[PDB]
Ligand binder design. Structure first.
Ligand SMILES: C[C@H](O)[C@H](O)C1=Nc2c(nc(N)[nH]c2=O)NC1
Ligand SMILES: C[C@H](O)[C@H](O)C1=Nc2c(nc(N)[nH]c2=O)NC1
Ligand SMILES: C[C@H](O)[C@H](O)C1=Nc2c(nc(N)[nH]c2=O)NC1
Ligand SMILES: C[C@H](O)[C@H](O)C1=Nc2c(nc(N)[nH]c2=O)NC1
Ligand SMILES: [Cl-]
Ligand SMILES: [Cl-]
Ligand SMILES: [Cl-]
Ligand SMILES: [Cl-]
Ligand SMILES: [Fe+3]
Ligand SMILES: [Fe+3]
Ligand SMILES: [Fe+3]
Ligand SMILES: [Fe+3]
Lengths: 336, 336, 336, 336
C-alpha cells in the first residue's frame, strides 16, 4: 500500500494516523437507514472516535432508554446460549466482566471502564472507532494490543440482527475472549505478523482472522464450542455453528488464509482449533513462512514495535530474555 | 511492618494505598520557612498529590515568574557542569528531554509531559508526590517503574541549595538517567527486591539506593562520572564528588547496604560501579541472598507483580520466555 | 516391572544390566532353521554381544563370502528403490555412509566403524545385541543415544525376506536415519520418555516407535516417503507402503499408541508425519501427558540421565541453558 | 601461527594433529638427567603418547617399585596439607578419586581408569602426552574437555621437587579440580576462547591459565584456598601461597593476562577469585572483548566445535536451547 515495505506504526502513539481510513453512513437494507433521529445519534457518536487521541480516557456516552433496550435484548438472549455453546474462555471472561465491569442487562457498559479492565487483565486496551477500518489499520492496532471498538448501538427495530459491528458485538462478542491470556496473545500475533506485509498478505491475514477471531470454533473435552466474536454475538449463527449443517475443518492457517467467504448469510465452513496454544503455534509457523526481511517483537514496557533486522537488534532483545531467565533461576532457589 | 510477610502491591493500581504515608511543612532552617505566601504555594501543590489517582493525566501547575526564576538558576548553573562531570547516560537523556520535552531555562516542565516521555522511552511514569514517602512505599513504587515525583519548587532565596527533593532535583537529577534502559531496569530491580521484605531489608535497600540512584559514581573510558540524582542536582556536591576530597570505593551491594551516611553535608564516601550492567548484576546477586520464600517478576503488559512461589507460577512465566525465544528464532531466519 | 517406579539406568555404563534380557534360537519357518553350520555362525556372533561391555571397541566379524553374498543382494535391490521411495534424510545419510563408512555391495560394514561414524555425526553409538531385547531395555538404550544392533546376517536362502532384525535391516534400515539430527533427537526422545514408565506406558511407547521408527511415513514436497527402518529394509513392504493399498493416517502419538498391529504380513495402516520437527513436537506433548512425578533430561557431557524432581535439580539444568544463551549472545555481537 | 585465522580443530578426532608439536629430553639441573636407566624409562613412556590415537583405551604402564616410591612420598606429604590449604572442590574431588579410582599411597593410578572417571563426572577425558605442548595445542585440547596428561614419574632423587609436569602433578594437582562441574566448564572455556585466536591472544590466555588453573587462589567462607594445580602439587609453594609473603590481587582476566611470571621460583603474585562462577563470568566477558569475527560453541553430543558465524548457525544452536527449555517446562508441571 505504501512502499517496498509499507509504512507501519512502531509506537502505540502512531495509531493516531492509522484511523484516517474509514467508511460512514447506512445502506437501504439497514434497520434504521430511514430514521433521522438515529442517523444523528451515530454522527454524534462517531465524533468521539474522530476526536480521540491515544492516551485520553474514552468519553462516556449517555445511553437512551431505548438504546439500553436494544442492549437488554441482545444480552439476555445470547446470555441464554453461552453455558452450552460458548468456550470456557468466554464463560470465564464474561463472568469477570460481570463481577468487575458491571456487565448487566439494564445498562450498556462504558468503553473506558472496559479498557481499564482489559489493561489489568491482559494488557489490551480499547480505542473508540467510527466503524469499519482498513484491514491493515485494524490488524496494525491489534499489534499493540489495541482493539478498535465501536461505541454506537444497532437500530432498535432489529435487535436480533446487526450488519455492521456495534457495541453489542464488540462488548459481548470480542471483549470477553480478550480477557484470556492465550487468546490475547493469539490476537496480537495476527497484528504483529501483519506489520509491513504486502496487501496480499494482509488479505490472507484478514481471512485467517475471519475464520478465527470472528468465526472460529474450538474443541474442549471433545465437544465443539464457539470463540469467534461473530458467533458469540449472533443468536442464529451461534446455534447453526454447532449444528450438523455447516462443514467444520481442522484449523490450519494456510487452508483458512484462502478459504473464501461472504458476510450476509451464515458461514457454510468453520475451522476448529484444538487449543489456543495449538492455534497460536500454527499461526506463528505461518507468519514464519511469510516473506519478510526482518521480524518484529513487541516492547510491552513502551508499547512499541522493535524491528529485529540485524544481529545487534536481535542481541538486544535476547538480553531482555536473559534477564528473565535470571529471575526464574532465582525463584527456583527461593522455593527450595 | 505488616505481617510475617508485609503486605505489598501486586497491581500498579494499588500504589493509591502506598501514598497514605508522608510528612509535610517546613523546619526553621528552610529557605522560606518564614514565608507565608510560599507555605500557601506548597499546600496548593501537595494537594495535587493527595488528590491523584493512578491513571489520570497529571494536573499541570502554572508556575509564577519567580518560580521560573529559581528554576532558571538551578538549571543554567548545573547545565554548566554536565559536559565534564556527568555520565554519558545523563547527557544522552538530558539532550532527549531538551529535544522532546521542552527542557529549557525559562520554563519549568510539566510532570505529565515528562511521564509521557519516560513511558515511551523506558516504561517509567511519574506520580505526583507531596514530599518524602516511607522507604517501603517509595521502593514499592519503583517496582512498577513508577517514580514518586515532587511538583513544588524550592524557595527562591536559596536557589543553589535545597534540603528536600524539589522538582528541580527530580527533573534535573533523576528523570534523565531514567531515560536509559539499563538504569531504568536497575532502578526497578531495587523496588522489585523490596517487595514484602523485612523493615531491616528495606533499610539495607534504601541504603543501596542512596549510594547509587541518589549518590552513585561510575567509571567510563577510565574517568569517574556522577549518575546519582543527588549529585546531578547539586552544584557543590557535583564538584566535590569528583574531587580528591572524598573516598571512592568499588560498588558492592553488601558493603554499601551497611555504609552509614548523613544528609546535611556532602558525602565523605561514594561507590563507583564499572557499568550499569555490572551494578545491575551485582544487585541481583544481592537480592538473591535475600531471605524470601518466593520471588517476584514484573508483568509489563498489566503493570502487575507476579509472585513466583511454586513450580506452576514459575512454569507460567517460563512460557512467556519461551514465546520470546521463538520470535528471536524467527528473526534469525528472516535476516538470513 | 520393578517397583512403584521401575528401576531405570541413569548412567550409560548401566546399559550393561539392561541386556540380561533377550530370546535366542530359530523357529520352523525360519530360512536356516535346519542349517547347523548357520546355527553355529549365530551362536558365535551372539557371543560378541553377550561379552560386550560399555565402552570397548566393537569386535570386528570376518564375514564369509556367502554372507557377503546375502548382503550384496539385500543391498543392490533396496538401493534401487531409495531414490524414489526414501525420505531425503535417508538418501543424505546413505550417501554419507557410502562416502565415509565404506557402505558398498561387496563388503558388510563393521559395527565399530559405523558407531564411530554415528558418534561424530549425531552422538549415537551402536551396542552389539544378540537379538530382540525387552521393550523397556531397548527404549532405555535409545535414551542414551545407544542403538542395540545385531551383527549376524540373515540365512542366505531367502535374502529378500528376514523375520528377525539382522545386520542388513540395522545397517540399511536404521542407521542412515540416525545420521539426521532431528530424527536422532526424536529417537532419543522416545527412549527418554520410557524411563521408569509403567509396563503399559512402555507398551504404548513401543507402539508409537513401531509406527514411526520402524514403519513411519512422512510427506516432503507434498509426496509421501518412507523413513521407517522396517520399510527401508524391505523390498516388498517399501513398494506397498507408498501404494494405494494400505490406509495412511496423520501421525498422532495418541492414535498410534493404541493402533494394533501384527508382524508377519505387511502393514494395513501407516502414519505420515508432516516433518520430523512436527512429529518430535507431537511426541513430546505426548510424553508430557504421561503420568510421572519427575522428568528426565540427558547430560551429553557424561552420557547420564538427570532426574528433575525438585526446584533445585531444575535450577541446576537451567544454569546450563543460561550458559548457552550467553554464548549465543556473544556470537551475535561478533558477527556484528 | 597458521593464517588470517589460524587453523583450529573442529572435531575431537583432530586433536591427533595438535600433538605433532612437543619438546623431549632433560637439562643439567634435572634430578635424573644423568641417569640412563631413567632416560630409558621416559622414552618408553613418551612412546605411548606418540602412538596414541583419539578414542583408544590408554595403555596401562607397569610402575616399578621405586616409581611407586617417589609417588608414595609426593602423595602422603601433600595429603597432609589438603585439609587446611585446599579448596573444597579439591577435597571433594580427591575424596571421589579415592572412593572410585583407587587413589592411594602405594599404587600409581592408571590414566585410562582416571579418564573413565572424569568422563562420567564432568565429560573430561585424558590424552597421554609426551611432555610440554605448544600453548595453542594445549588450550585447543582443553576446548574439547581433553586434558593432555603426562604418564612418566619424576626422578626418585628429588621427590619433593619436579620442574616439568609429571603424573604426580597431573594426577594430584589437576585431575581432582576437573571433577568439579563449574571448574571443568571454566577450564573448557579457556580453551574454547583460544580457538583460532592470534598468537598474542594465545599468550594472554596461557597467562590467564597460569594464574588460575596452574596457580590460582580462591576465597571460601572468607578464607583463602589454593585450586591451582601448580600449588596443589607442590609442598612448598602450597604453604607459601597462603602465607604473608606474596601479594594477592583480585582475579581480573585483563590484569592477569599481562602479569609477567617466571617458573623456577615461587610466585610473588597470585589472584584470588571469589567463586568459580564469578571467575567463569569474568573470563567470558574477557573472551567477549576478544577480536574475532565468529564465536564457537561446543557440541557435547559429537565432541565437535560449531562455528557460529551467521544468523543461520546461531539459529541452529538456539533450537537446541529451545528444546531444553521445553524439557524444563515439563519438569515444572510434573513436580506440580
Ligand atoms: C470494530 C470495527 O469492526 C473495526 O473498525 C474493524 N473491524 C474489523 C476489520 N477488519 C477485519 N478483518 N476484521 C474486523 O473485525 N476492520 C476494522
Ligand atoms: C520524590 C520524593 O523524594 C519521594 O517522596 C521519596 N524519595 C525517596 C525516599 N526514600 C529514599 N530512600 N530515597 C528517595 O529518593 N522516600 C520518598
Ligand atoms: C536390534 C534388535 O532389533 C533389538 O534387540 C530390539 N529391537 C526392537 C525392540 N523392541 C521394539 N519395540 N523395537 C525394536 O526395534 N526390542 C529389541
Ligand atoms: C601435561 C603437560 O603439562 C602438557 O603437555 C602441557 N601443559 C601446559 C602447557 N601450556 C600451558 N600454558 N599450561 C600447561 O599446563 N603446554 C602443554
Ligand atoms: Cl489453551
Ligand atoms: Cl552499561
Ligand atoms: Cl524437519
Ligand atoms: Cl562456585
Ligand atoms: Fe468483530
Ligand atoms: Fe532524589
Ligand atoms: Fe528395527
Ligand atoms: Fe599443570
Amino acid at each position: 500500500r505504501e512502499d517496498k515495505v509499507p509504512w507501519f506504526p512502531r509506537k502505540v502513539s502512531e495509531l493516531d494516523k492509522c484511523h484516517h481510513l474509514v467508511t460512514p453512513d447506512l445502506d437501504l437494507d439497514h434497520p434504521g437507514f430511514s430514521d433521522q433521529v438515529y442517523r444523528q445519534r451515530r454522527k454524534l457518536i462517531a465524533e468521539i472516535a474522530f476526536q480521540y487521541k491515544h492516551g485520553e480516557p474514552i468519553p462516556h456516552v449517555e445511553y437512551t432508554a431505548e438504546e439500553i433496550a436494544t442492549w437488554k435484548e441482545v444480552y439476555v438472549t445470547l446470555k441464554g446460549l453461552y453455558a452450552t455453546h460458548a468456550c470456557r474462555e468466554h464463560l470465564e471472561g464474561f463472568q469477570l466482566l460481570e463481577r468487575y465491569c458491571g456487565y448487566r442487562e439494564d445498562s450498556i457498559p462504558q468503553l473506558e471502564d472496559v479498557s481499564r479492565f482489559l489493561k489489568e487483565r491482559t494488557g489490551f486496551q480499547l480505542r473508540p472507532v467510527a466503524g469499519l477500518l482498513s484491514a491493515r489499520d485494524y490488524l496494525a492496532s491489534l499489534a499493540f494490543r489495541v482493539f478498535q471498538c465501536t461505541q454506537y448501538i444497532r437500530h432498535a427495530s432489529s435487535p436480533m440482527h446487526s450488519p455492521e459491528p456495534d457495541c453489542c458485538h464488540e462488548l459481548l462478542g470480542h471483549v470477553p475472549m480478550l480477557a484470556d491470556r492465550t487468546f490475547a496473545q493469539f490476537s496480537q500475533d495476527i497484528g504483529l505478523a501483519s506489520l509491513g506485509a504486502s496487501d496480499e498478505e494482509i488479505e490472507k491475514l484478514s481471512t485467517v482472522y475471519w475464520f478465527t477471531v470472528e468465526f472460529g470454533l474450538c474443541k474442549q473435552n471433545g465437544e465443539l464450542k464457539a470463540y469467534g466474536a461473530g458467533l458469540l454475538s449472533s443468536y442464529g449463527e451461534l446455534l447453526h455453528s454447532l449444528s450438523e449443517e455447516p462443514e467444520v475443518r481442522a484449523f490450519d492457517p494456510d487452508t483458512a488464509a484462502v478459504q473464501p467467504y461472504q458476510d450476509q448469510t451464515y458461514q457454510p465452513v468453520y475451522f476448529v482449533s484444538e487449543s489456543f496454544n495449538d492455534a497460536k503455534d500454527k499461526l506463528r509457523n505461518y507468519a514464519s513462512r511469510i516473506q519478510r526481511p526482518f521480524s518484529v517483537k513487541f516492547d510491552p514496557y513502551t508499547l512499541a514495535i522493535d524491528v529485529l533486522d540485524s544481529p545487534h537488534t536481535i542481541q538486544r532483545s535476547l538480553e531482555g530474555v536473559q534477564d528473565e531467565l535470571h529471575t526464574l533461576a532465582h525463584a527456583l532457589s527461593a522455593i527450595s
